[PDB]
Nucleic acid binder design. Structure first.
Length: 98
DNA sequence: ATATGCTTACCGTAACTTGAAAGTATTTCGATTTCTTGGCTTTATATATCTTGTGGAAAGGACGGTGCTCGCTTCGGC
């Protein structure tokens, strides 16, 4: 069975109280009868730390270097930017050249 | 001399969009299975008759260390 949007709060609370070291004990103390890998995916999907914030200037240098080094025609491989630049997903990163 | 007036660069998530990797049903090629006939094995006295294959004969060609001292021959003597 899927979640009911009521266990992620206690999950992140226990993860912050323990230090995000061992997710197995966290899942066992949470009492969901599910594997740690099955709940960690939804935890990271509901987490906000995976995203980014207002754009700086020093990262523009790296983006321009990566473009001038591995861009082809009118297509830009933003997946390479996701691989190199941490924090940027594939959805909202394309705006960096839109 | 400055705040709200409207105007627009842009960093908040979202879905219907183009096409390559990955799971799914389907008929076709080929390999497998199952039928068919028919001889294998016993017997029966019959017995035909003509050839086959043999066999003990005839008869052949085929290959089956070192003195040591009698005596044998050949010249060879005067």
């Amino acid at each position: 069975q899927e979640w009911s949007r009521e266990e992620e709060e206690r999950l992140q609370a226990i993860a912050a109280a323990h230090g995000h070291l061992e997710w197995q004990k966290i899942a066992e103390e949470l009492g969901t009868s599910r594997s740690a890998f099955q709940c960690l995916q939804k935890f990271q999907q509901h987490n906000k730390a995976l995203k980014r914030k207002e754009w700086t200037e020093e990262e523009d240098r790296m983006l321009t270097q990566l473009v001038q080094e591995m861009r082809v025609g009118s297509h830009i491989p933003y997946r390479r930017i996701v691989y190199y630049m941490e924090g940027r997903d594939s959805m909202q990163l394309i705006y960096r050249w839109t």
